[PDB]
Coordinates of C-alpha atoms in Angstrom, one line a residue:
Chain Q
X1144 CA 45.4 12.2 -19.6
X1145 CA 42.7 11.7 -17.1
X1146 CA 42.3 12.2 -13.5
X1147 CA 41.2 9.7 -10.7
X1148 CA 37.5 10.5 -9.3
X1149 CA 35.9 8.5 -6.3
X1150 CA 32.3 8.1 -6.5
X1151 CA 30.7 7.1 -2.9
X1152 CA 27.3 5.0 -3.1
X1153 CA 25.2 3.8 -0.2
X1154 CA 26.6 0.5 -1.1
X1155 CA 30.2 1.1 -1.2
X1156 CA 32.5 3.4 -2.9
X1157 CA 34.8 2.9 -6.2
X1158 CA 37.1 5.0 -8.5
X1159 CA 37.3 5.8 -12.1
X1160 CA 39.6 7.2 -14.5
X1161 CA 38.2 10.8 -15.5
X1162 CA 39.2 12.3 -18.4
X1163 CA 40.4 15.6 -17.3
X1164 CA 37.7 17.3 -20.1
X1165 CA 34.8 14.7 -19.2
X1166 CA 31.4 16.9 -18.5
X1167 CA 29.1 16.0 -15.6
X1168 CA 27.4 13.4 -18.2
X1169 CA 30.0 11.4 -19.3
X1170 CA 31.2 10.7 -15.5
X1171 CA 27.6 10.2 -14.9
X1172 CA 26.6 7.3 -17.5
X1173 CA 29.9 5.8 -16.7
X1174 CA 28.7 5.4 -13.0
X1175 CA 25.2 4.2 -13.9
X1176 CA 26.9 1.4 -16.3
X1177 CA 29.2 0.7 -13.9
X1178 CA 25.9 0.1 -11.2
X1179 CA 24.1 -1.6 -14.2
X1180 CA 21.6 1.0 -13.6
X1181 CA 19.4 2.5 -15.7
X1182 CA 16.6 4.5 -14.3
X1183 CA 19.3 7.3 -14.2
X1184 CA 16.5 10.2 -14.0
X1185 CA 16.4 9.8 -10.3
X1186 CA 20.3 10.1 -9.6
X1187 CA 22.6 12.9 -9.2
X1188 CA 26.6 13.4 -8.5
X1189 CA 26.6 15.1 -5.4
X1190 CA 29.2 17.4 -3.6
X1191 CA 29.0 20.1 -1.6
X1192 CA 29.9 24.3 -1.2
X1193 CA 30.1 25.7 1.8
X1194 CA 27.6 24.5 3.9
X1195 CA 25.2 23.8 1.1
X1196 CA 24.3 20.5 -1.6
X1197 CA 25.7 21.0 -4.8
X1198 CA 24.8 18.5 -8.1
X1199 CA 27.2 17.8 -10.9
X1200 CA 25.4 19.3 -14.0
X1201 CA 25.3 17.3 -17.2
X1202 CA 26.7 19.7 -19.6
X1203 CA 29.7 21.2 -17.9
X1204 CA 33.1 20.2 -17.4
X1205 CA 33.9 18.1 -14.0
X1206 CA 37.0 20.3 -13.6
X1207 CA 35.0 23.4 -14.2
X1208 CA 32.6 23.0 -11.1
X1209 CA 33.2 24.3 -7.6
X1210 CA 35.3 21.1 -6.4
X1211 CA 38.2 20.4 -4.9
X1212 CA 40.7 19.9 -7.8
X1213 CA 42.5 17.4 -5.3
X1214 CA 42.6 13.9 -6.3
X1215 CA 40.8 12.1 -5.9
X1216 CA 38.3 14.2 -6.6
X1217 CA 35.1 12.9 -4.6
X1218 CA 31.2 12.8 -5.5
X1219 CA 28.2 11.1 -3.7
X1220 CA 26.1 9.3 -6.0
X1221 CA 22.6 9.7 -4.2
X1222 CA 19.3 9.9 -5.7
X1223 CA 18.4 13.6 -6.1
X1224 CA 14.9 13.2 -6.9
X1225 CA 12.2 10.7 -5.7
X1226 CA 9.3 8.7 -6.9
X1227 CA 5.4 9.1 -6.4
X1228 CA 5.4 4.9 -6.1
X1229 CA 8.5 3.0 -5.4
X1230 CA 6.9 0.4 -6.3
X1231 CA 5.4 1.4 -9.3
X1232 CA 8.3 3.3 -10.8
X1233 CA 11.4 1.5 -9.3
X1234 CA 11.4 -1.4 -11.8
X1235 CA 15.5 -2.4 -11.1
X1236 CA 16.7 -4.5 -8.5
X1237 CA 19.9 -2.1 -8.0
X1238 CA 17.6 1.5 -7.8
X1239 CA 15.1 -0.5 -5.1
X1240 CA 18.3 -1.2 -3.6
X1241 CA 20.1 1.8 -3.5
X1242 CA 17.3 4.1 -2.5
X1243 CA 16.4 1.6 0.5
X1244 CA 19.6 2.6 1.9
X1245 CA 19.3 6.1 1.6
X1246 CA 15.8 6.6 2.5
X1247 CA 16.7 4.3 5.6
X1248 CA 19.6 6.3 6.8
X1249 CA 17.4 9.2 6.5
X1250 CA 14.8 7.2 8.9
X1251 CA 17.8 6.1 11.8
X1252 CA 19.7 10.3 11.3
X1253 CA 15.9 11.9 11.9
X1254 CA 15.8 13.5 8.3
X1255 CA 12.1 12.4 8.0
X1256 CA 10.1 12.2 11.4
X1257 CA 9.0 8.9 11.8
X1258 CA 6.7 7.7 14.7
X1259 CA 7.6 5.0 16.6
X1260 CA 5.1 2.1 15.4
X1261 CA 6.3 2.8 12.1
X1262 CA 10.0 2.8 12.8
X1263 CA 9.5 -0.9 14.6
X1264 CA 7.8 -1.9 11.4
X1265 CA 10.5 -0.7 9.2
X1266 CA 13.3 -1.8 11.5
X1267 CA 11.7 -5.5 11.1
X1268 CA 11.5 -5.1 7.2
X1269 CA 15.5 -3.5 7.3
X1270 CA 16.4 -7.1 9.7
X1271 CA 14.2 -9.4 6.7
X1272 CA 16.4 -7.8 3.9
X1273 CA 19.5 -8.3 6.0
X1274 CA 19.3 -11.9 7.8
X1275 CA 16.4 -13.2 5.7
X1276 CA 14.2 -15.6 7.4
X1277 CA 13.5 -14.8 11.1
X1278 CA 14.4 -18.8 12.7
X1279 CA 14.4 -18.8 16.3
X1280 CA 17.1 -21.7 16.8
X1281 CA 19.3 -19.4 15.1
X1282 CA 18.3 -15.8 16.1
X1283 CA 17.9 -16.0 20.0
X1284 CA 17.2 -13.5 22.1
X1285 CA 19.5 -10.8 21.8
X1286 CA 20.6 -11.5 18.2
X1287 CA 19.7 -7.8 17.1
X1288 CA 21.9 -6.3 20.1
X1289 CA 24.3 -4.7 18.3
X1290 CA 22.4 -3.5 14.9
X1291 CA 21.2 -0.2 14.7
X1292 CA 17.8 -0.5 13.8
X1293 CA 15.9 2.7 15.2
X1294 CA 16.0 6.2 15.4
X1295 CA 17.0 7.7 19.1
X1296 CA 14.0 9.9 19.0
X1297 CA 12.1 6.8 19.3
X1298 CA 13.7 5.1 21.9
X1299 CA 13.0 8.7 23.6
X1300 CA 9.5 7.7 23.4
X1301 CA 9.3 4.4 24.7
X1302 CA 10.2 3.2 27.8
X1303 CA 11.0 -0.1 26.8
X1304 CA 13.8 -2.5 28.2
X1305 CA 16.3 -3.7 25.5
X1306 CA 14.8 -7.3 25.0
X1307 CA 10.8 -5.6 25.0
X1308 CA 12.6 -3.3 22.0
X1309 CA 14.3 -6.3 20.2
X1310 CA 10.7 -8.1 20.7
X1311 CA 8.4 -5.4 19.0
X1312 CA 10.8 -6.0 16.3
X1313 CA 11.0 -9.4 15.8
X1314 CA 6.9 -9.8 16.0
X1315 CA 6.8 -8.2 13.3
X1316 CA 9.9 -9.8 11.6
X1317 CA 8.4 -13.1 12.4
X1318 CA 5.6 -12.3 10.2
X1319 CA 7.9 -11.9 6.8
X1320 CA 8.7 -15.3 6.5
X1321 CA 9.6 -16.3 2.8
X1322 CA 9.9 -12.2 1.8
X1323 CA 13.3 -12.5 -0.3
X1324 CA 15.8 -9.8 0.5
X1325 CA 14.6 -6.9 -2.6
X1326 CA 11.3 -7.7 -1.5
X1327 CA 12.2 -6.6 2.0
X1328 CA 13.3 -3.6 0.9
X1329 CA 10.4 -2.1 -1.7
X1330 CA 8.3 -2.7 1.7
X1331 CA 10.3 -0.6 3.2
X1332 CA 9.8 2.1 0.6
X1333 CA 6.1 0.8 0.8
X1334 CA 5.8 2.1 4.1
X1335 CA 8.4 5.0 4.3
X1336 CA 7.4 7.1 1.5
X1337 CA 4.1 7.7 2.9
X1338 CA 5.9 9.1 6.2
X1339 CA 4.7 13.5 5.3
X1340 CA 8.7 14.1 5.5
X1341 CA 10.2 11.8 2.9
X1342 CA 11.3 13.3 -0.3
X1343 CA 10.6 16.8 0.6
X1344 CA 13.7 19.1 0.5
X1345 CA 13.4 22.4 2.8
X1346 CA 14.2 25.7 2.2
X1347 CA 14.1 29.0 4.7
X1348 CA 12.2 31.6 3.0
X1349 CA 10.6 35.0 3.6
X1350 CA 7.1 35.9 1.8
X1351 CA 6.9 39.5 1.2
X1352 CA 5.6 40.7 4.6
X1353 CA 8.6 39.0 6.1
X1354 CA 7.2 36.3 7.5
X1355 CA 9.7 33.0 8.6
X1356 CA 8.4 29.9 6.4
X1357 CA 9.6 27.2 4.9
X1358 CA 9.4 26.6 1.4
X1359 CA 9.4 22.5 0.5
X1360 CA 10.5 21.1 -3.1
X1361 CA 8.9 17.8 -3.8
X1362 CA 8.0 15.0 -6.8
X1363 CA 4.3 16.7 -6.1
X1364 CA 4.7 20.1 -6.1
X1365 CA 6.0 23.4 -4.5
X1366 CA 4.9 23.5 -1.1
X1367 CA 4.9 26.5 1.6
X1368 CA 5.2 25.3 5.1
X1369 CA 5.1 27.1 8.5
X1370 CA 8.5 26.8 9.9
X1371 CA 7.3 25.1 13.2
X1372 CA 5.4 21.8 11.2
X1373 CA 7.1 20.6 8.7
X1374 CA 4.5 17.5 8.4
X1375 CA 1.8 19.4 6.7
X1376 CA 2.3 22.5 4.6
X1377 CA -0.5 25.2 4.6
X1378 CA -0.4 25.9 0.5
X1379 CA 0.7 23.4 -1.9
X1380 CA 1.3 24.5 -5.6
X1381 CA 1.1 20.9 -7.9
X1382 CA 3.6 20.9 -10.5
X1383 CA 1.1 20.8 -13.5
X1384 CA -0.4 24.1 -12.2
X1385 CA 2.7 26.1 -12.3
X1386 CA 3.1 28.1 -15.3
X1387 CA 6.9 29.3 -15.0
X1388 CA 9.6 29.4 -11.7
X1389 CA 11.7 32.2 -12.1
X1390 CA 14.1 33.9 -9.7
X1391 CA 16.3 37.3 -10.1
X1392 CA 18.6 38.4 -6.8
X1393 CA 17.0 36.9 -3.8
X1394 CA 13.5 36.7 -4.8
X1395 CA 11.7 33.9 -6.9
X1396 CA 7.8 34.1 -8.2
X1397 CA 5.9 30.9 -8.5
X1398 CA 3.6 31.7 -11.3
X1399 CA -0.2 30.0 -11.2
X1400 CA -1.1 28.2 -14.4
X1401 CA -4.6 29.5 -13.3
X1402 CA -4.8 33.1 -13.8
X1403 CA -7.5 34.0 -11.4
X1404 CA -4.4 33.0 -8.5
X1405 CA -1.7 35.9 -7.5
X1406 CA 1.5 34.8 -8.3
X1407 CA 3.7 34.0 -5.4
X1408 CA 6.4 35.9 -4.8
X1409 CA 9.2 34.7 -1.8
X1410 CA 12.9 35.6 -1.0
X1411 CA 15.9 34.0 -0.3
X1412 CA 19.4 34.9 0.7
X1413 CA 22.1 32.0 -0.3
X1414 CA 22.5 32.2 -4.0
X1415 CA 24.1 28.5 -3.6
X1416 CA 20.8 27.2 -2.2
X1417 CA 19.0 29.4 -4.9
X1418 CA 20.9 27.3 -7.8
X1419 CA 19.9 24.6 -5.7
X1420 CA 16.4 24.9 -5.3
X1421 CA 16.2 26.0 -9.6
X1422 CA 17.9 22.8 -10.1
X1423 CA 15.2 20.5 -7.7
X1424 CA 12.4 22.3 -9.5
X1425 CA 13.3 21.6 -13.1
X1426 CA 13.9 18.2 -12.1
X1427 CA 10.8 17.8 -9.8
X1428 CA 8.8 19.6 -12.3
X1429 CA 10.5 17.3 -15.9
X1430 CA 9.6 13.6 -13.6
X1431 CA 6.3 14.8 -12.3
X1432 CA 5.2 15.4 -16.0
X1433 CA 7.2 12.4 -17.1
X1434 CA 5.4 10.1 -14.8
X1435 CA 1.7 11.2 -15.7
X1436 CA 2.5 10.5 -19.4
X1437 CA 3.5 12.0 -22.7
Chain J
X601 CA -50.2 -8.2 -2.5
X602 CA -46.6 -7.9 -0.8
X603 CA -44.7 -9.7 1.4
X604 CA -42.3 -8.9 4.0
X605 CA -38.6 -8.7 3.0
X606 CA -36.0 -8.7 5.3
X607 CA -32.9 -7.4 4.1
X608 CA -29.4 -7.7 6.3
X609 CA -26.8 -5.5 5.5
X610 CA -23.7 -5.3 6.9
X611 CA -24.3 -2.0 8.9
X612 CA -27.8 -2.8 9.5
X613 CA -31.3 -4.6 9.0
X614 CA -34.1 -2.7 6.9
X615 CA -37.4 -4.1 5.6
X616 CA -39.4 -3.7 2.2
X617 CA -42.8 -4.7 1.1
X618 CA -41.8 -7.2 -2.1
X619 CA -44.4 -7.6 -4.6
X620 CA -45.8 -10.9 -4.8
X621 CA -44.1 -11.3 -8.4
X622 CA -41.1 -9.3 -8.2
X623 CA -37.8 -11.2 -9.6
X624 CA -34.3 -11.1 -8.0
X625 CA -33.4 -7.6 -10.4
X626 CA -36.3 -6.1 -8.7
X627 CA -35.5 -6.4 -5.4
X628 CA -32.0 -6.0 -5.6
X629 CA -32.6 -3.1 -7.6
X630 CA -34.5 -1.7 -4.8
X631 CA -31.9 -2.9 -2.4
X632 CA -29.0 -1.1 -4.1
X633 CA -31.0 2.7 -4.8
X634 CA -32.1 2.7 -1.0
X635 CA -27.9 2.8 -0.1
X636 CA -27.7 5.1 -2.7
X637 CA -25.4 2.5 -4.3
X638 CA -24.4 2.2 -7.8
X639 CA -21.6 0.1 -8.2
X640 CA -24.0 -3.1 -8.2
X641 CA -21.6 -5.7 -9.9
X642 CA -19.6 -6.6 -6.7
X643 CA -23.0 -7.1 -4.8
X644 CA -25.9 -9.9 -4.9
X645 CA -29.1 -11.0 -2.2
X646 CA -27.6 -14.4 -0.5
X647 CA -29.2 -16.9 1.2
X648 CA -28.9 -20.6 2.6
X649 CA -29.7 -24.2 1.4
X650 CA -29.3 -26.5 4.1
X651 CA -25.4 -25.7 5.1
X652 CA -24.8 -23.8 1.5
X653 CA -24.7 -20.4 0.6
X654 CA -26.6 -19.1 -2.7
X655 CA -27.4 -16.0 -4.6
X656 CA -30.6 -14.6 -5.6
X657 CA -30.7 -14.9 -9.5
X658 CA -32.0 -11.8 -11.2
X659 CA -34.4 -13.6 -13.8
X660 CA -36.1 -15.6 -11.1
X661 CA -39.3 -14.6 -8.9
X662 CA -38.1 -14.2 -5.3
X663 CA -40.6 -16.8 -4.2
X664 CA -39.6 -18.9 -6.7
X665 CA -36.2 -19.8 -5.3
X666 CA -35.6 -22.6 -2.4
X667 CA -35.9 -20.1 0.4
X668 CA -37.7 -20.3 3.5
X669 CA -41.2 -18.5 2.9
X670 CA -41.7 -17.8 7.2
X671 CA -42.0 -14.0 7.2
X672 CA -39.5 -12.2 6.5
X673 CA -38.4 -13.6 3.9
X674 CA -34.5 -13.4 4.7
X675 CA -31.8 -12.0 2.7
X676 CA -28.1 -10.9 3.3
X677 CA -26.7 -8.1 0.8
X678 CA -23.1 -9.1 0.6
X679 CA -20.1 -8.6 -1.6
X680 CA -20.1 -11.6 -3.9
X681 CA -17.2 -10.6 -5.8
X682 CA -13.9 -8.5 -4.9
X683 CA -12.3 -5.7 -6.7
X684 CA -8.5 -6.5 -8.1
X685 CA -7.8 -3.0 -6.4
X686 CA -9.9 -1.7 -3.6
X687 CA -8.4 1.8 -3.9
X688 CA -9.0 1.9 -7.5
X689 CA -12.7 0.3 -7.9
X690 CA -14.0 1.1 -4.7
X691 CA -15.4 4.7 -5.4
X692 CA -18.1 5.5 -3.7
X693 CA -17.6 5.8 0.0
X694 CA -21.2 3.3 0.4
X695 CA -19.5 0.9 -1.7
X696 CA -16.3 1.5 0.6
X697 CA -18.2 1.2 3.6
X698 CA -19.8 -2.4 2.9
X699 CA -16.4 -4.0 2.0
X700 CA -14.7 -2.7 5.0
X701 CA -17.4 -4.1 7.1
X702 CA -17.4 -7.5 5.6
X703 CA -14.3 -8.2 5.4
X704 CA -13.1 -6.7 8.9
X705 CA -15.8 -9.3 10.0
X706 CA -14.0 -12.4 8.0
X707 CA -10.8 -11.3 9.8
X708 CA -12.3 -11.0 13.3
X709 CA -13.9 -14.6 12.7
X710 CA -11.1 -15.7 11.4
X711 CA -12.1 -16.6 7.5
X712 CA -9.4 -15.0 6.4
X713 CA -6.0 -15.8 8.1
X714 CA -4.2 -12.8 9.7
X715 CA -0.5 -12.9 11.7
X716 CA -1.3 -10.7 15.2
X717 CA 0.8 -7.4 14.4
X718 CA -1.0 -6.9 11.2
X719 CA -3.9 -8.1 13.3
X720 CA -3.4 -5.0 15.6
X721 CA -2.2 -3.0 13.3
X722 CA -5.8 -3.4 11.5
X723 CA -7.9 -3.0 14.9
X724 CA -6.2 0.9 14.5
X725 CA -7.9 1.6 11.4
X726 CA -11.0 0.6 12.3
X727 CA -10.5 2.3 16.3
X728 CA -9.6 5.2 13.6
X729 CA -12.7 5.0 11.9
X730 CA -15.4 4.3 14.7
X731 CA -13.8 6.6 17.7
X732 CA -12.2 9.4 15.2
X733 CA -8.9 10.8 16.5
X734 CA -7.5 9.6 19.7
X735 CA -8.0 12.0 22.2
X736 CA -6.5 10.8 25.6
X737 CA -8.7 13.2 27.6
X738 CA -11.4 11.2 26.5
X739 CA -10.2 7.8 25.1
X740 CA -8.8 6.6 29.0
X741 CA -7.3 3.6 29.8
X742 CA -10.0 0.3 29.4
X743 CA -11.4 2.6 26.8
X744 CA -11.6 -0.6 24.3
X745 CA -12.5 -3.2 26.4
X746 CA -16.0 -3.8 25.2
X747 CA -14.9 -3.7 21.6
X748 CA -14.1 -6.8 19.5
X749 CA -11.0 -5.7 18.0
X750 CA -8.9 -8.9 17.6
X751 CA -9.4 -12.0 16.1
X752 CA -9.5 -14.8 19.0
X753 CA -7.1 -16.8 17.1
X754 CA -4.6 -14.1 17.8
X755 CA -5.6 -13.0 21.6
X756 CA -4.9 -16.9 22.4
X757 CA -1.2 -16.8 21.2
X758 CA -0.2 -15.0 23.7
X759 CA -0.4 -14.4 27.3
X760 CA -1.6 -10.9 27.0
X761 CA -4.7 -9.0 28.8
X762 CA -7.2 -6.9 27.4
X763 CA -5.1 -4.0 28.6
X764 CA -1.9 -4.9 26.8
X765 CA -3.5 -5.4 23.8
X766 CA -5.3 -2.3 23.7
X767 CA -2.0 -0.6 24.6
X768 CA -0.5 -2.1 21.7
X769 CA -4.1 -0.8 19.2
X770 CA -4.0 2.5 21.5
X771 CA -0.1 3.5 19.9
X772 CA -1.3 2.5 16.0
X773 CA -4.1 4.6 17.0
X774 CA -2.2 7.6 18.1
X775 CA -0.5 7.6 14.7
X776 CA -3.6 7.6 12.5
X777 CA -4.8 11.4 13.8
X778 CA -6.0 13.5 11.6
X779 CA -7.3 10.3 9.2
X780 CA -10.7 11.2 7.8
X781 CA -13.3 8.0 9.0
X782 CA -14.0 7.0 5.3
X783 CA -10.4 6.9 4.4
X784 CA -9.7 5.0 7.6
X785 CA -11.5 2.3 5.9
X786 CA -9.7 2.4 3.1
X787 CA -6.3 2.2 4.9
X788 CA -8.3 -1.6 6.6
X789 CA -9.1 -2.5 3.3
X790 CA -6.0 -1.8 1.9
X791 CA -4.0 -3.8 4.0
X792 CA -6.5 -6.3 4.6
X793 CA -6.7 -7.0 0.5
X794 CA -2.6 -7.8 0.4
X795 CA -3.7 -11.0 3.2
X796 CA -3.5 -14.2 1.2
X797 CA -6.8 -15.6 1.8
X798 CA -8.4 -12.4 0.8
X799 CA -11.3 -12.2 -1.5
X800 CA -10.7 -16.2 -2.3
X801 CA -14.0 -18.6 -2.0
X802 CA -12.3 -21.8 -1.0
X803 CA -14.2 -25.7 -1.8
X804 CA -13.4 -29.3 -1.1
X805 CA -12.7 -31.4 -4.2
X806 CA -11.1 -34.5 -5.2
X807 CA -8.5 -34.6 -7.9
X808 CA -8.6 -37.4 -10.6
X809 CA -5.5 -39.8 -8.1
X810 CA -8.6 -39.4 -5.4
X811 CA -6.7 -36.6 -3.5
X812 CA -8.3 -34.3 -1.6
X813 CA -7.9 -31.0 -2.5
X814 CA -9.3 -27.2 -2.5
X815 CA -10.6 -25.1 -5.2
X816 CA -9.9 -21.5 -5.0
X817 CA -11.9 -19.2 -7.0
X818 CA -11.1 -15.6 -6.8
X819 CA -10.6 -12.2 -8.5
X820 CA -7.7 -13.2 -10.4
X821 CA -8.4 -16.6 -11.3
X822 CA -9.2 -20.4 -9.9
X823 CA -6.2 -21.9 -7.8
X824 CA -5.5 -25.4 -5.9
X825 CA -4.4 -26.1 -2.9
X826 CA -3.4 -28.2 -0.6
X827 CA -5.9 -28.7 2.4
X828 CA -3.2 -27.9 4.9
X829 CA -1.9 -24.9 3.5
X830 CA -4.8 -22.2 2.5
X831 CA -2.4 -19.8 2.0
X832 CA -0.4 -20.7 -0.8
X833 CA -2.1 -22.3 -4.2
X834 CA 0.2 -25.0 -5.6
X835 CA -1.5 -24.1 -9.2
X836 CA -2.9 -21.2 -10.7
X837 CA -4.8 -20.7 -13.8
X838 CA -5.3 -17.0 -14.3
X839 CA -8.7 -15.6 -15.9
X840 CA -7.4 -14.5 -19.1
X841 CA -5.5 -18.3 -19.5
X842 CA -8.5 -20.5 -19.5
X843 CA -11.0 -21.4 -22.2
X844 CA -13.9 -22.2 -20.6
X845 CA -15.5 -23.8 -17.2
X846 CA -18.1 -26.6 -17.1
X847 CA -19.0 -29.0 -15.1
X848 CA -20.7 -32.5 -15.9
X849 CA -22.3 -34.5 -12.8
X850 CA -19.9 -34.2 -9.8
X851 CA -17.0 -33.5 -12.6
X852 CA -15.7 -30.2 -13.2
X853 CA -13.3 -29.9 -16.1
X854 CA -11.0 -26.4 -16.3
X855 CA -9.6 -26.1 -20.2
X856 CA -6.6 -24.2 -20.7
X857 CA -5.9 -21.9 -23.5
X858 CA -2.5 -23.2 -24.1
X859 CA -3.1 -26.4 -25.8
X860 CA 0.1 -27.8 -24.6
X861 CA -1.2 -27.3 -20.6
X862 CA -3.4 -30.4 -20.4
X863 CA -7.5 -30.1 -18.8
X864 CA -7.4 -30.2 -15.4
X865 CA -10.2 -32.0 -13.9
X866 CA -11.7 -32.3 -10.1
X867 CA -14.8 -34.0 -8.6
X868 CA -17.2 -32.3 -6.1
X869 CA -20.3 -34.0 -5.1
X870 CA -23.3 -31.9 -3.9
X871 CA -24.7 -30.2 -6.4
X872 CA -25.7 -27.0 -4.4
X873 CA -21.8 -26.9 -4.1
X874 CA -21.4 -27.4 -7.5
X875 CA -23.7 -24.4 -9.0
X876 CA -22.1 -22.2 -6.4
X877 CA -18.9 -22.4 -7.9
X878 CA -20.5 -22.2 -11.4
X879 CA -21.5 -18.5 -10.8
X880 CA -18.5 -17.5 -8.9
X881 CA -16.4 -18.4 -12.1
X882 CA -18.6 -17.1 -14.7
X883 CA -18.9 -13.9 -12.3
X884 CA -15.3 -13.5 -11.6
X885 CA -14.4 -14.0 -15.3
X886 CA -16.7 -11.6 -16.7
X887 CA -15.2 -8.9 -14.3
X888 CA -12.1 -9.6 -14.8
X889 CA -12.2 -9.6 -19.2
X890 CA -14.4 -6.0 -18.5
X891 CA -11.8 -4.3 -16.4
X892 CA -9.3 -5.4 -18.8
X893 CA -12.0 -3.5 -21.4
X894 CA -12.6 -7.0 -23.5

């Protein structure tokens, strides 16, 4: 028969009957249909091993993955890859949607560093999409007291009293009068993908004099990264000028379409963040290709 | 023989010897290789009659136009035309450099309308791009306070002193180091472009009921508006949806494509007004068809 599977989204979460021989696809495009969504190349199934972020792959069995066989058995539906332009490539109402919320929870949890000028700009974009129209006979001061609207790193920074914090926001707020909700939220995206941190997935690596670095997997490119700034890397490797990826026990070689540079050779230990890292570089390297035409 | 031109840019004031004969082309020619500037079609040679502005025509002798002949002869080189996308057309950093001049001077005397946050927000690129990075060491408190940074619309909105507002440029500021000068610029312009008066050359007509009204005439098309409300046009007819411009008397006539969209005609009175906005359409429509490639 089939077997109940719950699929969490940044919106809310909802359950489906799976049959118990699905693959990873046909739970997949049933999601997507169920969203109306169909700029599916950015999205993903996601659960995890160990301590480490696993994807549902398209050609294998539900049941046969490393999941609880518990029902109901539980995925996040997340975006897995990113866009260049948000507002170039998101063309659906739902995608602009559910990546504002993800992207924005990543801002408020401190998974991308964002300065504090930019967070009060954001929050005031995040408050447009929620309460619409900034009206000051309805939002008096202290309407935004109980939303959470910035990260604490920020508040860190400032020493700002709780209404000079609520003001920032609303200046700017004030000044998106007649922005309707979706628009709110692609100029969020507007503004937070060009934050250095957004989109880039990190890795702990060694090169081979066993030095500590960071390697960072992103819609532009391979990217090595000394382990203390993770704003700006020192090499980047675009996807169009890598030849081939490959990886065999805990080292992988980044191979230069241009043969006059060395291949790059790295290690690293987890085999589950291995598969993980192949599986954001096909991806990364498929979109980035996909998106420059042909 | 020559005769002395005087020729104002927008970063400075230089003089050439013009030949007694020369046209408009010749001069402006000049003009454009001393800058080292080759993307001429944005640019012209303005000057006044009585409280109008006009453009140098090419085909003409200089002397030969209505300008005042008291050496130096007087001429502003000026953007006469914008670019649909700054980033995209703007190429060389010359060109980049004039437009961010101009129009960071329209903001700061307030022809183009701008809220106060994005206000400030703009006074940190172009802090950015004058001072380099913030350095604290050096950029101390009252650093600013000679600059004109704000437009005066905005610093009387608010009961704020020069301090407090260069507090609030100094933290946009801090956020913009590492931001090469040139591409400071481009960040102004960038922002500056989305502002809805931007790059629109507005004049005072009557419609056909006798109402008063303005004509819009920018990059994108020609629009009408409301006299109270420059910031939104109540009608727009796009470039590539009108037939032709002309102009009989003090009656301009704007012919639609789409036969079923009647003409739309308007009445402006002073001729000077009238041949202005003849060139600005025929100018603005040719660019547009071209960077369409027709």
């Amino acid at each position: 028969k089939t077997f109940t599977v719950r699929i969490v989204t940044m919106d809310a979460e909802m359950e489906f009957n799976c049959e118990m021989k699905w693959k990873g696809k046909d739970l997949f495009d049933l999601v997507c249909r169920t969203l109306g969504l169909r700029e599916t190349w950015f999205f993903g199934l996601q659960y995890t091993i160990k301590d480490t972020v696993a994807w549902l792959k398209m050609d294998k069995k539900v049941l046969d993955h490393d999941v609880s066989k518990e029902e109901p058995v539980t995925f996040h539906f997340l975006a897995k890859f990113y866009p260049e332009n948000a507002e170039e490539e998101l063309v659906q109402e739902i995608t602009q949607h559910l990546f504002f919320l993800q992207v924005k929870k990543q801002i408020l949890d401190e998974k991308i560093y964002c300065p504090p000028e930019a967070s009060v700009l954001l929050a005031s974009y995040a408050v447009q999409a929620k309460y619409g129209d900034y009206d000051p006979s309805v939002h008096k001061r202290g309407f935004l007291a109980q939303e959470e609207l910035l990260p604490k790193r920020v508040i860190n920074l400032y020493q700002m009293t709780p209404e000079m914090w609520e003001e920032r926001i609303t200046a700017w707020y004030a000044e998106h009068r007649g922005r309707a909700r979706d628009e709110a939220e692609m100029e969020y995206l507007k503004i937070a993908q060009d934050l250095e941190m957004y989109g880039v997935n990190y890795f702990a690596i060694r090169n081979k004099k066993g030095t500590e670095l960071l390697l960072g997997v992103d819609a532009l490119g391979l990217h090595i990264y000394d382990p203390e700034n993770r704003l700006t890397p020192k090499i980047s490797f675009p996807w169009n000028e890598i030849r081939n990826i490959s990886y065999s026990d805990k080292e992988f070689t980044i191979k230069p379409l241009d043969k006059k540079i060395d291949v790059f050779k790295f290690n690293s230990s987890k085999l589950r963040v291995n598969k993980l890292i192949l599986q954001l570089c096909i991806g990364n390297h498929d979109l980035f290709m996909r998106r420059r035409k042909a």
